[PDB]
């Protein structure tokens, strides 16, 4: 209906730069600094490996059939050749996991031989880790006194080598493997070697890692289905062992030729061969179990630090499973939870059965009709299922380590990257989880992939990573990763939201990082960016990128000048979006740093001038940035600016104006910046300069993913309003109930000056002459809040208005000097934040708010009416009034956007249509005394007719300006000294106040509806400023206040 004029859908000042309770982020405050946890720089290497092998062949030790070792029958070759070959095999078996490390073998040794072995390994691999592999199968079991058994020369005795002396020979960075019976006994000895303390875990201290085959009481298996070398052959030859175990147990065994496992085609590297793909799946399966089972710190040490420890501890989870089946329970020193029977070995068992059945026919002919296992595809689907349902901080997604494994092969690279990005998007926690798995270096190497299929996803992944951790700068620049995103800025690949991310990724790459600046400078990032300057987030981030590039880097600054950067940036200072403008100010701001002119003085004068044009900006966000650029400039020109400040107390006098202007700004955070800039000049070493915040605030956009009750309370109020509009109109309004429903003591010593009834709640707002703001409830007879609108000494209240009545009202408070302050949560007991503050008019300021258009009209004792668009926070228009005397009163129409009424000091009246090339519509006298118009308003209706024109002379004059100049109707409110007027929004009713104590309500046709007399509380006889008369918007409730100290409320029974 037409009553959609009465209900404006325009919301204003409810954007992220106007943020509320927890976040003082909006601006002023610096960005939230982080402290990372995933950081262990030391990529450790196992440099030396000592294989000690204690087996007399056909001489069992007296603690006693199966006897295979390193996949050799030691009886088949005779003792000395057998023991050589097993030494050679076991070496190459280990060597496949760590090919760049030295391997030294020791067969049936003396204690003296082991001493030199260990001393030599430690001397070879100084800080690097040393591996000790012991095999005590042909010697007695380790003691409870902490002993290993070796030989003497002649092989007549078993000689006890104590663990103490081993651990003296090898030191700190070392790792042990004990493939013997009763192997725990060694680990218990190790635990007691050193003094307890030196840690905050179960029982640790050094960097001594220990893998052992079985428990204290336990003995290694004896059945022929296992070898003797079970633990070793799990740890060192996992696939061969896993399958051979699988045949002999699960499928029952006699169907499948077991020796096909030895003849599996391909090599362990090729993921496209059947062997290497089975080895891939194993790593993927094993690594996944470890990640879901262990905590961040322990997993990273064992599974991410050393290529060989990662292999050994991966392959240890197979031992955890197999040994178990043969009455053995192995233990590592960093102990790790139970790993067998995890829902994931199930997936291995499946993949191995599908492999082993296939193997029979691939041997019949090398057909290479090897179907890649579904495993990977199957698991990425279970990651998608997780990403929909339960996708919270509701325990990790489990498939995550497998998503990493897929990034390593083109086979399913795009969907993996897509799903990873989908996962990173849900928050910082998910970025923290991904980086913990170890996604960083793989995603970093993918910045050499030319495939355009990827890049759009890769920019997004990197956006999310760099939104969390800024420090990846160093790694990105070192690999030339910066070029990947510069390409993306200059690409033909569409979508400018992707390009903003590119510009953000580069801005972070550059941020306080001269290696990155210089790299991007050579890569022509000034040219790339400035090419695009001819969407708002993209513009915002081009400036932030450019600004960060030249910041404190004079080569780039020179390049920016001689690429006319000022000429391209400056036009963004007019843009409607505050975010853009503020970013534009930043960019020009960071370009900075008698009678002489060289190149730069032409630029830096032209820059600072263009910044000073935006000192008066409506957004504090902008003003903050302008003050920082002024601070920077002020640093460089202290010589000149002090001399300019001497005479004030070419361009420098303009700066001093702006500094003192900033110091008296309504937003106190801006004010304090102005006070800072002043103090840099010496009015009352770089570290004193304030720092820009526009970059830090904007970055939060990316660390944030890329509802219904919003409409609920909207329609609540609209239904209430539409109904009460019709009732206001259609009910035949009776006389005033002179018995007031409240007579509230403000405790304003001088009295109440302006007041405001709330539409959708039972609330009053009142204002002192010093701009204290109270929020009185009339239905509870209580105070909801108390304020001080600003601490400045020169006070003065002009106006109170609600902004966004239909959805969480903000309280506008206009001051007589033209300052405007808008407060959220003004009804709360003392949690009431200043949302925005700016100086309209650039006195006796008068103001009015038009929700329909988003326009704030402001003027006073000035030639002009000033127009503010609060969606933009800009000074949209300066309309000359064409009066040559002051605007005393000012009413914007609720219905018709743009259209404005204005009363004047000489009693005159003017319409404006502020959206017209010539704004003044008509100019009329009506009432003819030559006294100021104390109040006016458009009539309650849907036309441009006008109650208007209460003159201070006392006559209220009605006029319909479509048809005639002279008056509809005159009503004589008061013989002189009319001090206020109130015109209802919808109901056909008005009211007027006198300095002679008196208040008179009238009908719109002119009838008297009720006299009231505000009596004085003592005999000052000064009820002479009956200033606040105001109606409830949707009800017939009056509210009256005066030069005494009471706010009385009335109604019509």
């Amino acid at each position: 209906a037409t009553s959609m004029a009465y209900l404006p859908q325009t919301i204003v000042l409810c954007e992220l730069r106007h943020d509320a309770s927890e976040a003082s982020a909006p601006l002023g405050t610096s960005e939230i600094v982080l402290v990372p946890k995933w950081r262990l720089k030391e990529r450790m290497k196992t440099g030396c490996v000592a294989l000690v092998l204690c087996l007399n062949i056909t001489v069992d030790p007296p603690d006693v059939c199966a006897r295979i070792e390193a996949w050799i029958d030691p009886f088949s070759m005779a003792p000395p050749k057998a023991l050589e070959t097993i030494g050679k095999n076991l070496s190459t078996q280990y060597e496949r996991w760590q090919p760049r490390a030295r391997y030294k073998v020791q067969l049936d040794p003396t204690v003296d031989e082991v001493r030199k072995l260990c001393l030599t390994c430690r001397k070879y691999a100084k800080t690097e880790r040393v591996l000790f592999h012991y095999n005590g199968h042909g010697v007695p079991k380790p003691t409870a006194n902490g002993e290993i058994w070796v030989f003497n020369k002649s092989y007549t005795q078993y000689i006890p080598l104590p663990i103490s002396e081993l651990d003296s020979w090898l030191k700190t960075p070392s790792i042990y493997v004990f493939d013997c019976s009763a192997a725990r006994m060694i680990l218990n000895a190790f635990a007691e070697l050193h003094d307890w303390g030196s840690s905050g875990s179960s029982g640790s201290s050094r960097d001594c890692i220990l893998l052992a085959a079985c428990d204290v009481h336990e003995t290694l298996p004896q059945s022929v289905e296992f070898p003797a070398d079970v633990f070793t052959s799990c740890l060192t030859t996992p696939i061969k062992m896993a399958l051979k175990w699988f045949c002999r147990r699960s499928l029952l065994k006699e169907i499948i030729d077991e020796s096909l496992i030895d003849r599996i085609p391909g090599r362990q590297n090729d993921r496209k061969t059947l062997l290497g793909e089975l080895n891939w799946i194993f790593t993927a399966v094993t690594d996944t179990i470890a990640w879901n089972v262990l905590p961040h710190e322990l997993f990273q040490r064992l599974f991410r630090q050393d290529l060989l420890v990662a292999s050994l501890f991966r392959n240890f989870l197979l031992a955890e499973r197999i040994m178990r089946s043969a009455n053995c329970n192995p233990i590592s020193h960093p102990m790790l939870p139970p790993t067998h029977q995890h829902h994931m070995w199930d997936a291995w068992d499946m993949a191995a059965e599908i492999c082993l059945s296939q193997l029979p026919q691939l041997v019949l002919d090398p057909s290479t009709e090897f179907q890649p296992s579904p495993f990977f595809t199957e698991q990425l689907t279970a990651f998608e299922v997780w990403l929909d349902h339960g996708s919270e901080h509701k325990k990790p997604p489990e498939q995550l380590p497998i998503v990493l494994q897929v990034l390593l092969s083109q086979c399913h690279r795009f969907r993996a990257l897509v799903l990873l990005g989908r996962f990173l998007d849900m928050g910082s926690w998910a970025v923290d989880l991904a980086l913990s798995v170890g996604i960083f270096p793989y995603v970093l190497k993918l910045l050499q992939t030319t495939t355009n299929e990827l890049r759009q996803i890769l920019v997004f992944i990197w956006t999310k990573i760099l939104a969390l951790d800024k420090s990846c700068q160093i790694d990105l620049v070192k690999d030339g990763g910066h070029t990947y995103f510069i390409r993306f800025l200059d690409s033909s690949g569409a979508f400018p939201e992707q390009r903003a991310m590119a510009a953000f990724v580069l801005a972070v790459i550059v941020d306080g990082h001269r290696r990155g600046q210089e790299a991007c400078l050579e890569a022509n990032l000034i040219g790339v960016c400035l090419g695009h300057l001819e969407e708002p987030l993209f513009l915002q981030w081009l400036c932030l990128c450019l600004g960060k590039l030249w910041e404190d880097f004079m080569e780039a600054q020179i390049m920016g000048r001689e690429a006319n950067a000022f000429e391209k940036l400056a036009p963004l200072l007019s843009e409607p979006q505050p975010e853009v403008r503020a970013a534009a100010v930043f960019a020009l701001g960071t370009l900075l740093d008698e009678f002489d002119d060289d190149e730069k003085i032409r630029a830096e004068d032209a820059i600072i001038k263009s910044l000073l044009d935006v000192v008066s900006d409506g957004s504090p966000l902008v003003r903050a940035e302008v003050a920082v650029a002024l601070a920077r400039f002020a640093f460089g020109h202290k010589q000149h600016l002090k001399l300019a400040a001497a005479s004030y107390w070419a361009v420098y006098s303009q700066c001093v104006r702006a500094m003192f202007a900033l110091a008296k700004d309504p937003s106190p955070r801006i004010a304090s910046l102005g006070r800072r800039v002043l103090s840099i000049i010496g009015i009352e070493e770089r570290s004193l300069l304030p720092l820009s915040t526009i970059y830090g605030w904007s970055c939060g956009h990316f660390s944030k993913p890329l509802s219904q009750e919003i409409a609920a309370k909207r329609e609540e109020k609209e239904k209430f309003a539409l109904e009460h509009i019709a009732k206001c109109q259609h009910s035949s309004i009776s006389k005033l109930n002179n018995n007031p429903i409240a007579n509230w003591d403000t405790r304003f010593e001088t009295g109440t000056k302006t007041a405001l009834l709330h539409p959708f709640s039972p609330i009053v707002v009142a204002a002192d002459e010093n701009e204290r703001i109270r929020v009185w409830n009339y239905e509870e007879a209580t105070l909801l809040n108390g304020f001080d609108n600003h601490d400045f000494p020169d006070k003065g209240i002009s106006k109170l208005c609600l902004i966004n009545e239909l959805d969480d009202s903000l309280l506008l408070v206009a001051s007589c000097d033209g300052s405007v302050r808008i407060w959220k949560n003004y009804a709360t007991k003392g949690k009431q934040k200043l949302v925005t503050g700016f100086s309209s008019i650039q006195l006796n300021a008068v103001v009015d708010w038009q929700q329909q258009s988003g326009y704030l009209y402001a003027s006073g004792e000035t030639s002009t009416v000033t127009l503010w668009d609060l969606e933009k926070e800009q000074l949209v228009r300066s309309v000359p009034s064409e009066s040559e005397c002051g605007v005393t009163a000012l009413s914007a129409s609720q219905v018709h956007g743009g259209q404005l009424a204005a009363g004047f000091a000489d009693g005159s009246l003017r319409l404006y249509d502020v959206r017209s090339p010539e704004p003044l519509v008509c100019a009329t006298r009506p009432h003819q005394k030559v006294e100021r118009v104390v109040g006016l308003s458009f009539q309650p209706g849907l036309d441009p007719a006008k109650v208007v024109s209460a003159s201070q002379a006392g006559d209220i004059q009605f006029l319909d300006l479509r048809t005639t100049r002279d008056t509809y109707l005159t009503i004589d409110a008061h013989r002189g000294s009319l001090t206020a007027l109130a015109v209802h929004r919808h109901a056909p009713i008005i009211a007027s106040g006198s300095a002679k104590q008196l208040i008179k309500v009238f009908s719109l046709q002119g009838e008297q509806l009720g006299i009231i007399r505000y009596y004085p509380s003592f005999m000052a006889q000064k009820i002479g400023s009956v200033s606040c008369l105001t109606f409830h918007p949707y009800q017939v409730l009056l509210a009256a206040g005066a030069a005494d100290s009471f706010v009385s409320i009335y109604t019509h029974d």
């Binding site: 990529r43 991410r304 390593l408 170890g438 270096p441 793989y442």
Partner: peptide
């Protein structure tokens, strides 16, 4: 930097 190989 990583434990596992990558194909490109």
């Amino acid at each position: 930097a990583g434990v596992f190989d990558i194909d490109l």
